[PDB]
Design a protein around this ligand. Structure first.
Ligand SMILES: CN[C@H]1C[C@@H](N)[C@H](O)[C@@H](O[C@@H]2O[C@@H](CO)[C@H](O[C@H]3O[C@@H](CN)[C@@H](O)[C@H](O)[C@@H]3N)[C@H]2O)[C@@H]1O[C@H]1O[C@H](CN)[C@@H](O)[C@H](O)[C@@H]1N
Ligand SMILES: [Cl-]
Ligand SMILES: [Cl-]
Lengths: 267, 261
């Protein structure tokens, strides 16, 4: 066994974020495992407070939220059960829809922050605070939620960064944007979703690339590990966690080239 | 100055290796750095710390297992069925990834190797026969397996620069866990029976992909984060030492609370 630490302070997390390369005004997408950072004096919100302190109010912080309770599976239910879901399941409400189960404690904290913004796409919904929170989350199209009209696309375009805080590299949502952009020999295209329109629940059909299964013989772990191996990003400790800092545009470029050279029209 | 035998012994003991322990090793020889006398000195140092009363195991598998023959042209499959050699524990090579040390261990005097081709384990030391004996061909990571026995004798898993995703013991956790759905595989394999090649059908849980929305890295990272195991440097490698019983219990709970029915 390994015993818990004396709790990390706000100031010592700011120092570590800066030592890693976080700079004022950057736009960051964070993937974190809170337990991996270790005990923090004041709890997990201090992680976010420290990171925004390193970024200043001129910086921007975004996290993937999705929607834990999306009823995207109801076509597989028998007719009577499906009818029950159609009538009784709540719509996606950006104010109260809970983020996906894993590695999302900080996303849920971010939702109680004043001036938080949440994008409109339920399954692909992102949350953000800071200078470009509105810009990044605006007009997130319902179809192809990781594509050209996504917060991921905008993060790449404003040359933001991805910060890994003890989360496995294959949870980098940006890699779904690489899948979207890459010209590949086989893609799976897929579902119902209740949303709010003028304050009333309406069911819509969302069209997207499948993001549950890969489009071919690969895994996100493979791409990311290949990226780190070739020098991508910077590394450093943040609390007890091993942290990685990646340029969004570079990683996206690398991943699209990775996918196209194996399964693309250049293979 | 390459790492000396003594330097590695002291690092193993600093990490928590002790005389008499039964240990499964997962290593990346590259990660350790140059060792004076080569990679075998890693194993000699570890066995020195364990003493002859200790036991050292690694996953070997079978690099050349022809479990893919049904996906070949029929004409080629027919050639495989006539000409591909059976699994022979004496000479079957281990799988290529992170296995330099497993191949070294296969030349140790008194090494034992378990009979399940795909799931084959090699071991030396006091309990090497116990661990490798009567390894069932079906469900090779299940109840009749070296992993089950490693847990029963309160052994350990030592990660020596190898990735946390490569912990074979977690396939035993997958076997044990009551989950909503587990994928079963059935595949052909030639083995030796009374000195003769016989092709058989092996049944197992899939070990190539997880049975649900998880990764082994994620489980082991959660384990470490909640205080599981010890950590430290061995040579140039990041090392982790886990108790096999506690890690299995943690991983089964982890799987059941997330993907149970
Ligand atoms: C309309 N959506 C479904 C389309 C359907 N055709 C897909 O099969 C289905 O995906 C299954 O569920 C994944 C769990 O992640 C399994 O894939 C995992 O298993 C292996 C695969 N190699 C791992 O290696 C890999 O990492 C994967 N994690 C798939 O079997 C989709 O729903 C999921 O994905 C949605 C994201 N849009 C979530 O919103 C849902 O809650 C739901 N989890
Ligand atoms: Cl978390
Ligand atoms: Cl190796």
């Amino acid at each position: 066994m390994t015993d818990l630490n004396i709790p990390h302070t706000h100031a010592h997390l700011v120092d570590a974020f800066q030592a890693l390369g976080i700079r004022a005004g950057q736009a960051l997408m964070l993937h974190a495992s809170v337990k991996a950072v270790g005990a923090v004096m004041g709890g997990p919100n201090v992680i976010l407070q420290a990171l925004m302190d390193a970024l200043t109010p001129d910086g921007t912080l975004m996290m993937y939220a999705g929607w834990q309770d999306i009823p995207d599976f109801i076509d597989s239910l028998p007719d009577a059960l499906k009818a029950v879901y159609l009538e009784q399941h709540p719509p996606f409400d950006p104010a109260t829809a809970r983020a996906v189960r894993e590695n999302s404690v900080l996303a849920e904290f971010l939702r109680t922050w004043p001036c938080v913004h949440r994008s409109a796409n339920p399954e692909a919904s992102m949350v953000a605070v800071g200078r470009q929170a509105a810009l990044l989350t605006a007009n997130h199209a319902l179809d192809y939620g990781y594509g050209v009209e996504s917060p991921l696309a905008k993060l790449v375009a404003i040359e933001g960064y991805v910060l890994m805080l003890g989360a496995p590299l294959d949870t980098i949502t940006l890699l779904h944007h690489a899948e979207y952009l890459a010209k590949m020999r086989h893609k799976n295209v897929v579902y119902p979703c209740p949303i709010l329109r003028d304050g009333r629940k309406v069911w819509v059909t969302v069209e997207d690339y499948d993001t549950g299964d890969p489009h071919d013989d690969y895994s996100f772990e493979q791409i990311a590990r290949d990226y780190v191996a070739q020098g991508g990003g910077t590394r450093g400790k943040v609390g007890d966690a091993d942290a990685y800092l990646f340029a969004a545009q570079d990683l996206t470029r690398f991943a699209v080239q990775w996918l196209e050279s194996r399964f693309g029209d250049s293979a």
